[PDB]
Amino acid sequence: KTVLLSFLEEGFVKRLENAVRFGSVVIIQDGEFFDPIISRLISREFNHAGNRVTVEIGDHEVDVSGD
Amino acid sequence: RSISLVKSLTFEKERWLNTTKQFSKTSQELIGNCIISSIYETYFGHLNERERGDMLVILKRLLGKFAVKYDVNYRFIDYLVTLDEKMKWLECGLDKNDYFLENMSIVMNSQDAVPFLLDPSSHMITVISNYYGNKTVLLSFLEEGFVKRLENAVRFGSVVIIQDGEFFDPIISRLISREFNHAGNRVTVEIGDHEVDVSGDFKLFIHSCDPSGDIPIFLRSRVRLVHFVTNKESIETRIFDITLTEENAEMQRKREDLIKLNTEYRLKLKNLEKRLLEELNNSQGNMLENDELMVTLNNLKKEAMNIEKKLSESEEFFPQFDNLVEEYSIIGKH
Amino acid sequence: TRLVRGVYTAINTGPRQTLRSLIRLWAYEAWRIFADRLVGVKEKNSFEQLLYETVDKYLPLGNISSTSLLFSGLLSLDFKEVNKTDLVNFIEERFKTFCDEELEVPMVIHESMVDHILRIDRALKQVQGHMMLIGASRTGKTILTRFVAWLNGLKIVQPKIHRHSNLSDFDMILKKAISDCSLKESRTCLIIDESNI
Amino acid sequence: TICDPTNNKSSAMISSPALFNRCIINWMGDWDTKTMSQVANNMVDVVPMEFTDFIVPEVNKELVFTEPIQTIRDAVVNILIHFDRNFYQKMKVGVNPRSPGYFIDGLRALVKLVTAKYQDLQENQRFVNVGLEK
Amino acid sequence: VLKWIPRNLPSCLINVESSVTSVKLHPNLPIVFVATDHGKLYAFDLFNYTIPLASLQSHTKAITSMDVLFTNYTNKKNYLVIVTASKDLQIHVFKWVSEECKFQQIRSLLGHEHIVSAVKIWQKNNDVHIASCSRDQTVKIWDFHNGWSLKTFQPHSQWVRSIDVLGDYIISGSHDTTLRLTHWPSGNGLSVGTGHEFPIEKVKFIHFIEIRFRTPSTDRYKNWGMQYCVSASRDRTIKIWEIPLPTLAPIPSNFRCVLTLKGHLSWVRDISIRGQYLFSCADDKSVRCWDLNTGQCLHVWEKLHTGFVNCLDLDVDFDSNVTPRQMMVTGGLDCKSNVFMR
Amino acid sequence: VLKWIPRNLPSCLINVESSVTSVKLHPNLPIVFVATDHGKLYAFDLFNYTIPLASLQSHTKAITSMDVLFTNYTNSSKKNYLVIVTASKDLQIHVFKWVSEECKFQQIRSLLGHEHIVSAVKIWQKNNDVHIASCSRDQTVKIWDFHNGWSLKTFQPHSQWVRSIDVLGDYIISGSHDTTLRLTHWPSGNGLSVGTGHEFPIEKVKFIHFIEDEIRFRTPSTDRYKNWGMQYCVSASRDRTIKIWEIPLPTLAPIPNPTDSNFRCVLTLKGHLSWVRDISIRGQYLFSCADDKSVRCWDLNTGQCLHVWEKLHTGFVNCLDLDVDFDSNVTPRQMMVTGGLDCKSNVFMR
Ligand SMILES: Nc1ncnc2c1ncn2[C@@H]1O[C@H](COP(=O)(O)OP(=O)(O)O)[C@@H](O)[C@H]1O
């Protein structure tokens, strides 16, 4: 359940969204090319929407599984 | 310990021996009793007492011709109806008449067919509502908003009674025939103009208070029509109850209390005997080896003695009520 | 003129014929044309006796009773006699599939249903074939019709006629069915029950 | 589909030449004795009925709608068919089509009831035996 | 395939509520049927064997024996018939419906006046028969389809403990030390024999197969169809007998012991022959295998049960409709059924 | 090797407890996997078949389809293993490992997400990626990731519910309860073309894979089709008919072609007496079976029957399996397995 992404490849956003939604352990390679599009994960600024916890990434809101 | 317990249980030994000796007759008469009961449920819903007697004579003649034994002392109520059902039904407001009790058991044991109840007095609406207590919906074929409320009742599983059944609307046909789509892990029914989930706890009753009405063929051939109408003995019982409550209320209260308490005592004693036999069955060893079982059976026998003593003592007063009842048979007859 | 056309169709889509099989086919079509309308048992017996007498008079064969002539196109490619056991087994399997896919009905299979299903199939393989089923309630009319229509790939249309409705709704339903039959090439079996009049 | 051919609307539907001269009239009628016999033989096939002694009853051929009676099931089927016929005859439903609804429902109810009561019989006998042995 | 001996340890252990009184192996599927001493019958799948596939309370007293036959109709679908005889003086006949994992009762056979001790079922053409014997000393034959008796006879003064069926003949082993061959469709006794010291627990035909005791030594026995049988009793001894040839009902003439097998410490409870080997068990908590050609014990399963072993099951090797699978089953007092696979 | 036709009789008869819903041959070992109507999966040895090698009650309703794949990870330092995928009427798909050293079904995981019975499931492997696709009575086609165990793609190709899917490269061709096939590009989920011409619901549809050899319908006709990777497909229906279709070529995600959006039926096969239940192509031969107790061997060059196994089963024939002759990782063995309604399967060998 370990996913290897990169800031230097295409399809990054969707695969990270799925990993967030299902709770996999993600490693993003080539960290020197950090993309601020995932800023809300680094700062962990989540919306505690009642019984759920969500994060705004890319252009929409994605459920955080918590694992 | 062992000798005392076996001496106490000798009564149950005798009863058990008699039961197993009667096993042969009991097995011989089973098929005939089942035939009689099934026919009685299927055909006798809309017949009067005389017609039921005639049909039972005919059926017994057929059983005789084709060499099928049956209980010559067969009674529908005694064969199918138990104490718990009787007590609960009477508590719900059912009349004490045998005819009403038979109709109640037939309509309550309609597991597959939608029951159609004919009650000119609408008594059975009250009885059913008391039986289910709550979550009971009263619709009508003669009012607006019927379809939506029935849809919701289906979806959530309430017990629905539709009044004025003579105005049956075929828009609910798929419920009467119970033609459901078993959609994988769900069961749905097409009603009105769309598909509605069946919760599975939903139950439907149709009621009419217009005798000699008009039930169309489609509904008539697919429902278990049961008549709930008064007879001689119901009228006489009600007349006597009015006479007694007007003349002498204390005997009324004593009579009702004695009857109720004796019936409860009988139920308790029956269940206690059942518990005794079950406990002796699952001993996991010899009775001497299991001291807890010995103590349990002794305690059960003590409870049985207490219950039977209470019933026997309470019964001693009833002939007074028998004479008091005989006092007013003139009013009954007239 | 119906009998003529029937015989034609049976010969045209059938296997190689023998005189015996040809005559048996003629008797089968005679049953379908003339005898299906008879009500009592005595009339059916008289018709069977009449078939025997006519054959002896003009066509001098085995048993040609109503249940001895089971011609079908369900079990094969041509239209020919079939074994009772094979047809019963095939109908049972297809009926289980029909229950699974369309509607669960725990109905028992017997010989009369097989005769009736065969004649309904015969009727629904005709050009402009229409039939009117008369018999007691809960004898399997509607469900058997639906099953046959499912076997032949027809869309089943049952008008939702109910209380507080009138000729406007019935006209709309008929118009929709007509439009679908014509413009969408939708093969349709339209079931009209007497309670809907 | 017509259920009551004697009703006014059904009589109009049948006698009207617009429908009469085009449709194939298929007289379903009602179930005969052979169909009832076959249906009953299917229904009671799974009921554990053969658990007692049975003596072949001496009856006339006109009273038997099945093969010659050998088993209890044959007698039960014949009894049920005879009772349905007598019910319709004595209730005097005229010449109406004999709906088989009652027969079917009675068959299902009999299957269920016999199953349940035979189970109760066997369990009670087993418990009595165990008690006496103990 | 036949030259196969089970390993020392069972592949599968099955626990039941109480003592196992009889076990039979489903003739075509990996299913084992277990009849216990409380009147119940279980069906277990050998690959899912913890919770039974089916659990039936059929009788009210202990089951004493059972037999299984898979029908071979020449026209009508085939199915498995299970016949269960108990101390209730009743023989219940069931159909196994693999599609619902249930025991569908077909009927019951009545008529014996005491505990039924053995049953046997066989088929001729499309006719199926059920034979049995009980403590009332009577041996009775029922027609499966009809549901009532066909024939009755009494072969012994003492009551018959076990029977076997081949062709149209039955050897019945008595509660006495004697055994008797009778002609099935007439009741005419044909041969008698003794040699045991105590009541006979088992007796069965030895069928000819393509071995010392499984081929006819003369054309007379080839025409008759059988020459040898085997029995065992409470004298701890297994005895293999030659069957005398009658006046070819046949008219009578004693059984001749041709080989005696010993080794058990207690009563012999089961006999089963697979190819070249005789498998048996005793009331000494052991199973054992003798060679049928030389009459020596080849292998011993000690302490297979903590109680006594009541029954064995091995496949028939003398029937074209039976696959001789390499699987053997044992069951005994201690509420255990041991299944040896491969 | 590819010229082999089975003998007129089975090499062995394998008995099971109830109706056989599907069969699959183990791609390397002489083992056959059989799934039945009660939710049970079985593994049998083909030389000692009298006792099952193993069995497992995984689902609770009938298994509707089974597919199997033997992995081939590219030097990923992982042990390769047979993955057995089954789908049932329980609205579930179960994914198992075959543990050959123990001869058992080891469950890997389960996939959820359908609202009705699953009518087909397929598994295929790319460079170092394994995918599981399914279609079900809810009218949707869903593709899950094998390793991750959750849905990758969803799309709805038909207005009626989908009965059979086959996958080739990045395309899915789906037959439905409707009479029309549809070809869709699965990565983007954009429908490309439809094939009309059947009268009754579709039972099977399969791509026709090119063979490096010449065969009438297993070779491209143009450079465009050769480069595309597909020229023809085959489908079978309940109208007693098997049709060989010529696939239209979209503009190369692929763009639907405004003027070539329809399939062209190039050949029709008739001769079965009932519903056609399975089809399989080996070499130049098309093997199929029907609900008429029979199997047929067709010559793909002329569209005729070459051989017929009549009364092979006492009931309907439900499933066929042959090996893959268009994959370098699969040996085209002289093996066939048929399984059917009569609680039997027949295995033809050598
Ligand atoms: N052959 C049969 N076996 C068992 N039940 C039947 C049979 N035919 C009809 N029924 C009963 O009748 C009903 C189905 O017939 P249906 O088509 O509804 O008749 P109709 O709609 O013409 O009144 C069901 O309730 C079914 O139980």
GROMACS .gro file of C-alpha atoms in nm, chain E residues 58-325:
model
  268
  790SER     CA    1  -3.465  -3.841   1.184
  791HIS     CA    2  -3.526  -4.095   1.461
  792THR     CA    3  -3.599  -4.082   1.834
  793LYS     CA    4  -3.360  -4.363   1.939
  794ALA     CA    5  -3.013  -4.466   1.827
  795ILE     CA    6  -2.939  -4.539   1.462
  796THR     CA    7  -2.808  -4.895   1.425
  797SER     CA    8  -2.706  -4.902   1.057
  798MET     CA    9  -2.747  -4.732   0.721
  799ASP     CA   10  -2.670  -4.788   0.353
  800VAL     CA   11  -2.641  -4.573   0.041
  801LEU     CA   12  -2.709  -4.635  -0.328
  802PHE     CA   13  -2.689  -4.397  -0.622
  803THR     CA   14  -2.969  -4.488  -0.862
  804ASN     CA   15  -2.901  -4.588  -1.223
  805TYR     CA   16  -3.230  -4.550  -1.408
  806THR     CA   17  -3.245  -4.654  -1.773
  807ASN     CA   18  -3.501  -4.385  -1.867
  808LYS     CA   19  -3.631  -4.012  -1.492
  809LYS     CA   20  -3.332  -3.854  -1.318
  810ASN     CA   21  -3.090  -4.035  -1.089
  811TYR     CA   22  -3.028  -3.947  -0.726
  812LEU     CA   23  -2.878  -4.079  -0.403
  813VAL     CA   24  -3.097  -4.283  -0.167
  814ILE     CA   25  -3.011  -4.303   0.204
  815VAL     CA   26  -3.176  -4.574   0.416
  816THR     CA   27  -3.150  -4.535   0.794
  817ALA     CA   28  -3.262  -4.800   1.044
  818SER     CA   29  -3.295  -4.726   1.416
  819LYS     CA   30  -3.403  -4.877   1.747
  820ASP     CA   31  -3.747  -4.718   1.692
  821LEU     CA   32  -3.854  -5.019   1.478
  822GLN     CA   33  -3.852  -4.790   1.172
  823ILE     CA   34  -3.649  -4.761   0.853
  824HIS     CA   35  -3.649  -4.409   0.707
  825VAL     CA   36  -3.559  -4.365   0.339
  826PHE     CA   37  -3.432  -4.024   0.228
  827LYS     CA   38  -3.327  -3.852  -0.092
  828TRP     CA   39  -3.013  -3.639  -0.080
  829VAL     CA   40  -3.065  -3.311  -0.266
  830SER     CA   41  -2.718  -3.171  -0.328
  831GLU     CA   42  -2.877  -2.853  -0.464
  832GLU     CA   43  -3.017  -2.758  -0.121
  833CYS     CA   44  -2.791  -2.960   0.114
  834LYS     CA   45  -3.096  -3.113   0.280
  835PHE     CA   46  -3.239  -3.456   0.360
  836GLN     CA   47  -3.571  -3.491   0.176
  837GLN     CA   48  -3.765  -3.779   0.330
  838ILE     CA   49  -3.904  -4.019   0.071
  839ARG     CA   50  -4.091  -4.259   0.299
  840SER     CA   51  -4.059  -4.501   0.592
  841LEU     CA   52  -4.077  -4.880   0.605
  842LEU     CA   53  -4.261  -5.041   0.897
  843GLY     CA   54  -4.321  -5.400   1.002
  844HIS     CA   55  -4.040  -5.521   1.227
  845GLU     CA   56  -4.133  -5.581   1.590
  846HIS     CA   57  -3.794  -5.503   1.750
  847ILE     CA   58  -3.469  -5.312   1.695
  848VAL     CA   59  -3.361  -5.325   1.331
  849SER     CA   60  -2.994  -5.424   1.329
  850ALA     CA   61  -2.894  -5.406   0.961
  851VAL     CA   62  -3.016  -5.290   0.620
  852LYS     CA   63  -2.903  -5.344   0.263
  853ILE     CA   64  -3.016  -5.172  -0.057
  854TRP     CA   65  -2.952  -5.281  -0.415
  855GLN     CA   66  -3.096  -5.227  -0.763
  856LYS     CA   67  -3.204  -5.457  -1.046
  857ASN     CA   68  -3.274  -5.290  -1.381
  858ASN     CA   69  -3.505  -5.005  -1.268
  859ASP     CA   70  -3.623  -5.192  -0.955
  860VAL     CA   71  -3.484  -5.089  -0.616
  861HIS     CA   72  -3.523  -5.312  -0.310
  862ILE     CA   73  -3.454  -5.273   0.062
  863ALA     CA   74  -3.367  -5.573   0.281
  864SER     CA   75  -3.335  -5.562   0.659
  865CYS     CA   76  -3.330  -5.776   0.972
  866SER     CA   77  -3.412  -5.711   1.336
  867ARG     CA   78  -3.418  -5.866   1.683
  868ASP     CA   79  -3.753  -6.031   1.600
  869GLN     CA   80  -3.550  -6.294   1.405
  870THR     CA   81  -3.725  -6.197   1.079
  871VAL     CA   82  -3.563  -6.089   0.751
  872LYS     CA   83  -3.789  -5.873   0.535
  873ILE     CA   84  -3.776  -5.737   0.179
  874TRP     CA   85  -3.949  -5.416   0.070
  875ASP     CA   86  -4.005  -5.277  -0.278
  876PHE     CA   87  -3.861  -4.925  -0.285
  877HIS     CA   88  -4.116  -4.781  -0.528
  878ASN     CA   89  -4.425  -4.943  -0.376
  879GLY     CA   90  -4.347  -4.870  -0.011
  880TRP     CA   91  -4.458  -5.202   0.140
  881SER     CA   92  -4.315  -5.546   0.200
  882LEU     CA   93  -4.227  -5.789  -0.079
  883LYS     CA   94  -4.102  -6.104   0.097
  884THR     CA   95  -4.051  -6.240   0.448
  885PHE     CA   96  -3.845  -6.528   0.585
  886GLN     CA   97  -3.670  -6.645   0.903
  887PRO     CA   98  -3.324  -6.802   0.848
  888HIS     CA   99  -3.223  -6.859   1.213
  889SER     CA  100  -3.353  -6.950   1.555
  890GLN     CA  101  -3.150  -6.661   1.699
  891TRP     CA  102  -3.196  -6.308   1.575
  892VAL     CA  103  -2.994  -6.185   1.280
  893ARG     CA  104  -2.723  -5.929   1.359
  894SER     CA  105  -2.613  -5.852   1.001
  895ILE     CA  106  -2.686  -5.938   0.637
  896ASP     CA  107  -2.541  -5.889   0.290
  897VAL     CA  108  -2.681  -5.902  -0.064
  898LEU     CA  109  -2.533  -6.036  -0.389
  899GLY     CA  110  -2.737  -6.126  -0.694
  900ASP     CA  111  -3.042  -6.297  -0.546
  901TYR     CA  112  -2.877  -6.448  -0.235
  902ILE     CA  113  -2.833  -6.347   0.129
  903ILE     CA  114  -2.597  -6.474   0.398
  904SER     CA  115  -2.733  -6.378   0.739
  905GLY     CA  116  -2.510  -6.379   1.046
  906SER     CA  117  -2.702  -6.473   1.357
  907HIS     CA  118  -2.678  -6.373   1.719
  908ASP     CA  119  -2.582  -6.740   1.745
  909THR     CA  120  -2.236  -6.851   1.633
  910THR     CA  121  -2.378  -6.987   1.305
  911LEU     CA  122  -2.416  -6.830   0.960
  912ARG     CA  123  -2.663  -6.930   0.689
  913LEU     CA  124  -2.695  -6.879   0.312
  914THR     CA  125  -3.055  -6.849   0.189
  915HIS     CA  126  -3.205  -6.790  -0.155
  916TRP     CA  127  -3.355  -6.441  -0.152
  917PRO     CA  128  -3.668  -6.464  -0.372
  918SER     CA  129  -3.790  -6.797  -0.228
  919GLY     CA  130  -3.666  -6.816   0.131
  920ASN     CA  131  -3.521  -7.160   0.058
  921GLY     CA  132  -3.221  -7.219   0.282
  922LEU     CA  133  -2.918  -7.338   0.086
  923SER     CA  134  -2.623  -7.374   0.325
  924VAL     CA  135  -2.533  -7.348   0.693
  925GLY     CA  136  -2.207  -7.312   0.880
  926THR     CA  137  -2.040  -7.259   1.215
  927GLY     CA  138  -1.690  -7.214   1.355
  928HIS     CA  139  -1.723  -6.899   1.563
  929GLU     CA  140  -1.744  -6.897   1.943
  930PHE     CA  141  -1.955  -6.581   1.993
  931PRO     CA  142  -2.224  -6.381   1.806
  932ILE     CA  143  -2.137  -6.268   1.454
  933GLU     CA  144  -2.097  -5.892   1.410
  934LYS     CA  145  -2.039  -5.880   1.033
  935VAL     CA  146  -2.075  -6.097   0.725
  936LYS     CA  147  -2.044  -6.008   0.359
  937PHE     CA  148  -1.999  -6.154   0.014
  938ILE     CA  149  -1.660  -6.151  -0.156
  939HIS     CA  150  -1.709  -6.029  -0.512
  940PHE     CA  151  -1.497  -6.154  -0.800
  941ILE     CA  152  -1.259  -5.896  -0.948
  942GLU     CA  153  -0.979  -5.901  -1.204
  943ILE     CA  154  -0.616  -6.235  -0.612
  944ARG     CA  155  -0.651  -6.547  -0.397
  945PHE     CA  156  -1.016  -6.519  -0.290
  946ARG     CA  157  -1.159  -6.293  -0.564
  947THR     CA  158  -1.168  -6.522  -0.868
  948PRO     CA  159  -1.372  -6.840  -0.931
  949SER     CA  160  -1.165  -7.156  -0.892
  950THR     CA  161  -1.409  -7.356  -1.110
  951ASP     CA  162  -1.642  -7.290  -1.401
  952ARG     CA  163  -1.927  -7.399  -1.174
  953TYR     CA  164  -1.861  -7.108  -0.938
  954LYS     CA  165  -1.807  -6.878  -1.236
  955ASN     CA  166  -2.155  -6.970  -1.357
  956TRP     CA  167  -2.294  -6.935  -1.005
  957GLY     CA  168  -2.123  -6.596  -0.963
  958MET     CA  169  -1.969  -6.640  -0.617
  959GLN     CA  170  -1.746  -6.878  -0.423
  960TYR     CA  171  -1.621  -6.707  -0.104
  961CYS     CA  172  -1.747  -6.489   0.180
  962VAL     CA  173  -1.603  -6.338   0.498
  963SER     CA  174  -1.740  -6.294   0.850
  964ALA     CA  175  -1.619  -6.195   1.195
  965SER     CA  176  -1.761  -6.224   1.544
  966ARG     CA  177  -1.695  -6.143   1.910
  967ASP     CA  178  -1.436  -6.425   1.932
  968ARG     CA  179  -1.175  -6.173   1.802
  969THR     CA  180  -1.136  -6.381   1.484
  970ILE     CA  181  -1.201  -6.312   1.116
  971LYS     CA  182  -1.296  -6.615   0.905
  972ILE     CA  183  -1.296  -6.650   0.526
  973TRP     CA  184  -1.531  -6.922   0.404
  974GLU     CA  185  -1.588  -7.113   0.084
  975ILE     CA  186  -1.953  -7.116  -0.025
  976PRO     CA  187  -2.080  -7.465  -0.119
  977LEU     CA  188  -2.244  -7.505  -0.458
  978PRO     CA  189  -2.615  -7.604  -0.447
  979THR     CA  190  -2.810  -7.834  -0.681
  980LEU     CA  191  -2.835  -7.589  -0.971
  981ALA     CA  192  -3.495  -7.227  -0.643
  982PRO     CA  193  -3.166  -7.411  -0.591
  983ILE     CA  194  -3.192  -7.723  -0.375
  984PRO     CA  195  -2.941  -7.798  -0.094
  985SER     CA  196  -2.387  -7.843   0.202
  986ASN     CA  197  -2.185  -7.661   0.470
  987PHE     CA  198  -1.961  -7.356   0.473
  988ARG     CA  199  -1.591  -7.448   0.475
  989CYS     CA  200  -1.340  -7.220   0.646
  990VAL     CA  201  -1.054  -7.165   0.400
  991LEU     CA  202  -0.846  -6.908   0.592
  992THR     CA  203  -0.853  -6.772   0.948
  993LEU     CA  204  -0.721  -6.422   1.026
  994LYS     CA  205  -0.628  -6.336   1.386
  995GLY     CA  206  -0.455  -6.052   1.569
  996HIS     CA  207  -0.723  -5.835   1.727
  997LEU     CA  208  -0.747  -5.811   2.105
  998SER     CA  209  -1.127  -5.776   2.117
  999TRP     CA  210  -1.454  -5.797   1.924
 1000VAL     CA  211  -1.434  -5.745   1.548
 1001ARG     CA  212  -1.669  -5.461   1.450
 1002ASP     CA  213  -1.620  -5.409   1.075
 1003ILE     CA  214  -1.501  -5.590   0.763
 1004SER     CA  215  -1.407  -5.409   0.442
 1005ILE     CA  216  -1.215  -5.542   0.141
 1006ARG     CA  217  -1.045  -5.320  -0.118
 1007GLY     CA  218  -0.864  -5.508  -0.393
 1008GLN     CA  219  -0.593  -5.725  -0.238
 1009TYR     CA  220  -0.638  -5.604   0.121
 1010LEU     CA  221  -0.887  -5.665   0.401
 1011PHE     CA  222  -0.947  -5.371   0.634
 1012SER     CA  223  -1.112  -5.427   0.972
 1013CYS     CA  224  -1.149  -5.273   1.316
 1014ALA     CA  225  -1.216  -5.409   1.663
 1015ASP     CA  226  -1.320  -5.310   2.014
 1016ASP     CA  227  -0.952  -5.262   2.101
 1017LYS     CA  228  -0.928  -4.902   1.974
 1018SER     CA  229  -0.732  -4.998   1.662
 1019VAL     CA  230  -0.771  -5.042   1.287
 1020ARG     CA  231  -0.572  -5.302   1.095
 1021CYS     CA  232  -0.502  -5.421   0.741
 1022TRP     CA  233  -0.442  -5.783   0.638
 1023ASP     CA  234  -0.322  -5.916   0.305
 1024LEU     CA  235  -0.597  -6.116   0.136
 1025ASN     CA  236  -0.354  -6.340  -0.054
 1026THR     CA  237  -0.124  -6.451   0.231
 1027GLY     CA  238  -0.336  -6.392   0.542
 1028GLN     CA  239  -0.094  -6.172   0.739
 1029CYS     CA  240  -0.140  -5.836   0.908
 1030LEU     CA  241   0.043  -5.574   0.702
 1031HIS     CA  242  -0.031  -5.252   0.893
 1032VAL     CA  243  -0.178  -5.149   1.228
 1033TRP     CA  244  -0.335  -4.816   1.325
 1034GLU     CA  245  -0.314  -4.814   1.704
 1035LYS     CA  246  -0.502  -4.562   1.917
 1036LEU     CA  247  -0.697  -4.423   1.623
 1037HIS     CA  248  -0.990  -4.366   1.862
 1038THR     CA  249  -0.991  -4.324   2.238
 1039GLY     CA  250  -1.300  -4.543   2.232
 1040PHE     CA  251  -1.386  -4.841   2.017
 1041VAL     CA  252  -1.410  -4.819   1.639
 1042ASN     CA  253  -1.764  -4.892   1.522
 1043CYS     CA  254  -1.750  -4.867   1.142
 1044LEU     CA  255  -1.535  -4.830   0.830
 1045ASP     CA  256  -1.615  -4.713   0.477
 1046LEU     CA  257  -1.424  -4.798   0.161
 1047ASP     CA  258  -1.544  -4.773  -0.197
 1048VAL     CA  259  -1.681  -5.068  -0.391
 1049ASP     CA  260  -1.425  -5.213  -0.634
 1050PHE     CA  261  -1.663  -5.463  -0.800
 1051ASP     CA  262  -1.905  -5.220  -0.969
 1052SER     CA  263  -1.861  -5.035  -1.297
 1053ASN     CA  264  -2.067  -4.746  -1.155
 1054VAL     CA  265  -1.837  -4.690  -0.853
 1055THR     CA  266  -1.504  -4.510  -0.876
 1056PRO     CA  267  -1.254  -4.681  -0.640
 1057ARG     CA  268  -1.130  -4.357  -0.485
   0.00000   0.00000   0.00000
